[PDB]
Design a protein around this ligand. Structure first.
Ligand code: NA
Ligand code: NA
Ligand code: NI
Ligand code: NI
Lengths: 309, 326, 326, 309
């Protein structure tokens, strides 16, 4: 035959060999004495090896059996180990998170601190990269969830909204809009805007736009350099204010209440995942992290955008 | 949720084999073909496993399979369960007794001397109809001979990276550090990879694999990341190196099987890397994939494993302190 | 011997060019063709050099040329002599003034912010008819744009390993180590490669090349030998990394040009590797080999070199201690 | 033109720029004042740049010249550096030596010690490998010289003989030839010889031969293992006696005076090399190293082969 032993057969062998009685062994395995015998005989017939000698009062392991016993035992130990590691509505184990570059720096320390202090069994793994790369990794299973601007517009993905994050206007210190808090969308025409692909959504009740020597930057650092040097102005998410907007050479302004200038940040994951509940719990952490970043921005004394509604 | 872990459930080997195959193939079609079962029954077995455990192991899309993080964590445990079962079966063919006739074995020079007496003794006593022929030579020569049929099997460091071959893993063999008696690291048992800078290591092409959790000096991408800073650019023999170590012109790494023969003479001391450092080699048996003698070679592998275990106990019996691992 | 060194002899650049070409080509035929001279006159020039010096540089066989050990030792010195002469000529075309019209430049994110203001200032003041267009993005994007003609030149870490490109080397840029204020290595200026184990380095794909005389962690054979032991598997931005460093969750490497902008805020300290450690990157200009604008690009390279020199002086003026090299 | 400046032209420029007079400059360069002028004008015409202004009493470097001066100066410094590093019937600088595996271990420490103490400017580099590999490296210039058994029989190579090295017979302790010093070549038929490809040459006046489970070994260690275990006997070069033949489980024997059992060790190098004199000087070191190894062998108290002639 092309016989392969089963774990139940191996369990019968190991138990008999250690108990040295059929009665004791069958009771320890919660099976009948005929079934115990059947499984042993199936094993000995499959192998072509007598493992156990049976007498009236006692059982003896053959020399062939003593040689094979440690190997059967390691097989059962590994199976028990598999089961033990396979062991409930909570954030535990590995969680691999993609985060876009214009969000990551400003919330990552809060998020990691909260996980370390309050979710001690969670094992977070963070990948920071551009939206398109994050979605490719998500699709291929190299990350579990991606924190990014919504809508994702990615097939087969589900979205959990986290928060709306306002932008602030950042100019050179000497720019005539320095300190203004009532700008209209028309004010855009008077700035040499260098914008990043950061999910910004700009509109008011009439105009919808939610649709320099440097053609395009991928980093806010390149942009801020140009702004300090007087060659441009830009939009910065408010979470980045403490880190990016407090150095000399910069000033800030804001649009009026009637202008929307924000981005919708969300968690995106594969529809095929069973982990929706874990991701929702993780969302709560990210919302807190953002609120901590917002309070840090407010504590700089820089005036933040005011909104209606 | 109310569809979590099933208490009386125990996974079967067939269920574990379905899991491992899907996880490695990443398609249901190629997995079912490899297991010679239907695509519905593959699915049935996997769902039985996932329902028993209360854990999603695989995510299913139209074109694609993805192993979940829970699945990746459990994959090595399923694999060890199957490996132990295959090991049991392999040792149960001690009755089969297929090791007869001529067997020509290539063995690398930093392994052969230290396991050859055990292996030949075991063959002579327990496999009296086996007719062993041993060729001891450098890796490249052994592979040319293997390729051309002049040897049947080669015992060497894995990966072999040889076209047309199969590999049977035998064992991981640690190295010990060997210095001159006067070297400042003599006697240390907690050396880190940084110790390389002050060891003056003269290394052989002996399969050594050195790394810790942060730095990898192994992955031999056709360029050796450890350089020598000594008058000896390149040594091909351990005896040349040990002579240089006794003379105070460097230190080296020696396989633990070689300790009784090489590391007990005057002028030498030994040291070891710490638990967190890997400093070992993967020894394997390599043969031509077309061979009808796979089962004989697997039986021969078991003999080599015993021979190595005997060499390790001989090393231990010298009283020299060996590498500890986690 | 009585056919040793000639006292009044001075080597000429043409003689040195004959030597370097033969040494690299290893045939007289391909060397003479590359220099557009006859095979006899190539030989004549080499023999004039060897007779002047009293040193055999090349051994001649029928099929083969071999550079002598004396020759291998002198080869980098001949090469630096020719490079300096080419540099002189390249700077003498400051009068030529070929940098006009549109020039679209790709620059990697860990270089662009720190040299962009200098470069644009120099262009605006001294090359008023040049019309620069800057694209700042990750290496792979820049190379796709370069390949497709959407940019003319890319400023990036060498080697580029991009098909169809030429490279102009610009400069080697050292890194500085950046830690949290409380890190035990804060302030050190003598760190060895072993310090990696206790730094918790979060590294970017920024061209960093780390090695000393014994260990090479650079040679990126499509597999990163330094691993991270942190919650952050992979960061693509320096700002993410610096935030993590301030928060005490790791250390990093920062190009020295970025010191004024990135390394002067509270919560950070700096350190450096010792003289014997290399921790730098080779920055170069990469362009399509078919281009008729090679001379314009070489002139643009000189501007970038000045911009970098200005960024290094800005870094120096902060009072932060920079890496020393041998 | 496709003009390239010459070093002489650059030297004229740098000298004038530093001296600030044509007379002083021409004298410092040991050339005529017309020749100095000619070289400068050739440089300025080739470049299309005036580097020097000439007045009656004085010379002034133009702004274009001041900019170019450091580059000319580095060109001349590099040329002077080349010449300085290019600088006599002695063993100095790099010497890359191939040595066969059955010779290397037993002479390498003496040789390196002698070089380090007595030839402080020599920079030795040692490659130890099999004869065929050494010859491939020699041919390709990756080594300068190979220490090996003669004849090499390699095309285009020259040989320097170093010494004849005797072999000793090594058996298991219990072998009936233990301690014998008068063996004939016929004694070979009574040993299960495992021999290495080590250049051994065996003959007497009548028979010329100079022409186990282990089919073949490349290492003496594999062979000695088999000899201690009683499965073979072998031949060992006398230089290896202290290291290889003093452990328990071994005994030694020798052939009689009328038997030759030796190997001719030599240095082999490419005919195309000009370094014969250096190699001859290196040969003297190797001869001493071998004589030290021979005295070490003798000091073990093991009886060495006696020869006629
Ligand atoms: Na994990
Ligand atoms: Na050298
Ligand atoms: Ni991309
Ligand atoms: Ni070979």
């Amino acid at each position: 035959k092309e016989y392969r032993p089963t774990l139940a057969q191996l369990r019968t062998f190991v138990t008999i060999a250690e108990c040295k009685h059929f009665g004791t062994a069958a009771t320890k395995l919660s099976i009948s004495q005929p079934s115990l015998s059947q499984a042993l005989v199936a094993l000995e017939t499959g192998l072509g090896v007598q493992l156990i000698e049976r007498s009236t009062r006692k059982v003896i392991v053959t020399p062939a059996g003593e040689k094979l016993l440690p190997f059967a035992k390691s097989t059962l130990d590994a199976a028990e180990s598999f089961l033990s590691h396979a062991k409930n509505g909570s954030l535990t184990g590995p969680l691999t998170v993609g985060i876009i570059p214009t969000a990551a720096p400003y919330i990552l320390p809060s998020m990691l601190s909260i996980v370390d202090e309050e979710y001690p069994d969670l094992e977070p793994h963070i990948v920071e990269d551009q939206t398109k790369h994050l979605l490719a990794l998500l699709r291929d299973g190299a990350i579990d969830v991606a924190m990014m601007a919504l809508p994702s517009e990615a097939p087969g993905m589900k979205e959990i909204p986290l928060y709306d994050e306002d932008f602030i206007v950042v100019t050179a210190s000497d720019h005539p809009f320095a300190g203004r808090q009532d700008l209209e969308l028309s004010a855009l025409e008077d700035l040499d805007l260098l914008l990043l692909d950061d999910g910004h959504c700009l509109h008011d009740q009439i105009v919808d736009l939610c649709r320099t020597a440097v053609t395009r930057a991928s980093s806010l650092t390149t942009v801020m350099q140009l702004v300090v040097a007087g060659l441009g102005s830009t939009l910065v998410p408010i979470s980045a204010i403490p880190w990016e907007c407090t150095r000399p050479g910069l000033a800030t302004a804001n649009f009026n209440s009637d202008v929307t200038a924000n981005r919708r940040i969300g968690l995106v994951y594969r529809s095929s995942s069973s982990r929706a509940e874990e991701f929702e719990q993780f969302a709560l952490i990210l919302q807190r992290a953002f609120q901590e970043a917002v309070a840090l921005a407010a504590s700089t004394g820089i005036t933040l955008k005011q909104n209606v509604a």
